[PDB]
Design a protein around this ligand. Structure first.
Ligand SMILES: *[C@@H]1O[C@H](CO)[C@@H](O[C@@H]2O[C@H](CO)[C@@H](O[C@@H]3O[C@H](CO)[C@@H](O)[C@H](O)[C@@H]3O)[C@H](O)[C@H]2NC(C)=O)[C@H](O)[C@H]1NC(C)=O
Ligand SMILES: *[C@@H]1O[C@H](CO[C@@H]2O[C@@H](C)[C@@H](O)[C@@H](O)[C@@H]2O)[C@@H](O[C@@H]2O[C@H](CO)[C@@H](O)[C@H](O)[C@H]2NC(C)=O)[C@H](O)[C@H]1NC(C)=O
Ligand SMILES: *[C@@H]1O[C@H](CO)[C@@H](O[C@@H]2O[C@H](CO)[C@@H](O)[C@H](O)[C@H]2NC(C)=O)[C@H](O)[C@H]1NC(C)=O
Ligand SMILES: *[C@@H]1O[C@H](CO)[C@@H](O[C@@H]2O[C@H](CO)[C@@H](O)[C@H](O)[C@H]2NC(C)=O)[C@H](O)[C@H]1NC(C)=O
Ligand code: NAG
Ligand code: PC
Ligand code: NA
Ligand code: ZN
Ligand code: ZN
Length: 388
């Protein structure tokens, strides 16, 4: 059987390669498969979208509905890195691909991949690595070292599956913006890594035995600070934080709210028209096309703002030049899907598809029984050769 290596570069917008010299990605497009663009799951956050890739489920169904673990009763809200170690957040009734594969005789590994450093129903990933709290995500030398480790897992630890995560170009896109020269420099670094990745596959005699997927979780868009009609809760006349028992704001264009007992209607009628670029819903009325709201963890009130606008709560504390989390229909949020290997055709470009379908493909590539999921294998099966 063929091994599988899934690689994710966080926040790689579908067209980041169009205004950058990317020789190695162009070559991989010649040698393998490429989607015009891939539509991510909503919300377009790092952890929810990554867990979709390894479960084949929409976010409302696998339960990881936010980068931050939160608990409305206790008021705890843990940042992204801390949440990577909260077992109950990820082990909420869905089984990621590492565990499914290991229950069927395979050995799987996770390198910095979200959700890959916790147990699921008592089962641990065969090999797992998690970065430090102050990790540097753009050290190219450290990238090559991690790839060396991954190759050792395949060859010397007899692993059949590995999911490898990189935190760029997301970090750079946030700080400098997705249209900046810094981002393009980071995409050039990504492209040099793609080459090194394929170079390492060949050195280890795995070219004809290992399938490679290079994808990402979401895109990136510019946050214009010049704009004057900012979404600021502290300037809503009829709203008051005295009516709120729990809040999750100041986190991009997505907000959650739990009003105090009996004040839901008061809070809602005030916010439904507070700003023409903030869309506030009761949990039951949130559009179903997002496949996000129907989960017990979601609060009675949730909201999202228009492209290029973040949500400011009690006071403005956000300063990123680029952001994500917006409607997954927006082109700036679309991301990439690239693949090459013995199972994959060559020179093929397919029309766009939702990331919910990657899981079914990976299970077919591994030859394992998939968990029930929201995807359909027929979507991506045209990517693969016909067996004889
Ligand atoms: C989450 O990731 C951490 C790594 O950041 C995992 O911890 C690592 O676990 C492995 C296996 O238990 C340890 O490797 C062992 O090291 C000892 C001593 O070097 C050696 O005798 C063994 O042969 C093996 O190589 C590794 O030291 C350890 N590192 C740290 C920093 O904890 C952890 O297992 C992961 N957790 C889950 C739930 O996946
Ligand atoms: C960029 O990263 C390299 C690599 O760091 C080493 O390998 C990583 C995978 C990590 O797991 C650690 O084991 C190591 O720190 C750094 O290069 C090392 O730097 C130290 C000095 O701090 C030196 O003693 C080592 O010999 C170096 N190793 C190599 C292979 O060059 C480098 O310092 C980092 N640079 C920045 C700016 O972050
Ligand atoms: C969310 O937070 C609440 C508040 O602390 C937790 O409720 C407590 O749960 C423990 C055991 O889990 C009980 O012994 C306490 O009596 C509970 N306290 C209250 C005030 O209800 C709850 O367990 C947390 N849930 C998660 C998933 O972390
Ligand atoms: C998934 O997580 C949710 C919440 O984190 C769990 O729901 C809680 O379930 C307990 C009892 O089972 C209730 O007392 C809490 O009020 C529930 N909280 C919420 C927010 O619904 C749920 O049990 C978890 N499911 C699995 C399969 O782990
Ligand atoms: C706030 O509520 C008062 C009370 O009805 C109303 O007169 C006013 O128009 C409201 N303002 C906004 C911006 O909704
Ligand atoms: C760690 N990281 C910043 C590179 C990526 C994940 O963080 P986030 O911006 O998606 O919340
Ligand atoms: Na290019
Ligand atoms: Zn991300
Ligand atoms: Zn981000």
């Amino acid at each position: 059987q063929n091994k599988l290596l899934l690689v994710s570069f966080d926040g790689f917008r579908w067209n980041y390669d169009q205004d950058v010299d990317t020789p190695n990605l162009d070559a991989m497009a010649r040698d393998g498969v490429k989607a015009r663009y891939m539509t991510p799951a909503f919300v377009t956050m790092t952890s929810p979208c990554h867990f979709t890739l390894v479960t084949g489920k929409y976010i409302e169904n696998h339960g990881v509905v936010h980068n931050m673990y939160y608990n409305t009763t206790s008021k705890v809200k843990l940042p992204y890195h801390a949440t990577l170690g909260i077992q109950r957040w990820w082990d909420n009734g869905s089984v990621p691909i590492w565990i499914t594969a290991q229950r069927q005789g395979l050995r799987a590994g996770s390198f910095f991949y979200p959700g890959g450093n916790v147990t699921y129903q008592g089962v641990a990933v065969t090999r797992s690595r998690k970065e430090g709290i102050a990790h540097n995500y753009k050290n190219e030398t450290e990238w090559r070292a991690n790839i060396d480790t991954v190759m050792a897992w395949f060859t010397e630890e007899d692993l059949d599956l590995v999911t490898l995560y990189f935190g760029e170009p997301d970090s750079t896109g946030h700080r400098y913006g997705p249209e900046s020269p810094e981002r393009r420099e980071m995409v050039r670094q990504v492209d040099r890594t793609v080459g090194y990745l394929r170079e390492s596959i060949a050195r280890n005699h795995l070219t004809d035995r290992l399938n490679l997927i290079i994808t990402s979780d979401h895109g990136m868009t510019t946050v214009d600070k010049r704009a004057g009609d900012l979404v600021e809760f502290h300037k809503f006349p009829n709203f008051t934080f005295r009516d709120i028992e729990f809040e999750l704001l100041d986190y991009g264009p997505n907000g959650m709210l739990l009003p105090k007992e009996g004040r839901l209607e008061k809070v809602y009628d005030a916010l439904k028209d507070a700003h023409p670029k903030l869309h506030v819903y009761k949990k039951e009325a949130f559009p179903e096309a997002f496949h996000y709201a129907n989960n017990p963890r979601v609060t009675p009130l949730l909201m999202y703002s228009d492209l290029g606008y973040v949500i400011h709560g009690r006071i403005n504390v956000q300063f990123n030049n680029g952001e994500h989390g917006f409607d997954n229909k927006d082109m700036d949020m679309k991301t990439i899907f690239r693949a090459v290997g013995p199972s994959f055709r060559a020179g093929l470009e397919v029309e766009p598809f939702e990331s919910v379908h990657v899981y079914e493909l990976m299970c077919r590539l591994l030859g394992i029984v998939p968990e029930a999921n929201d995807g359909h294998l027929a979507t991506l099966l045209p990517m693969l050769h016909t067996e004889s």
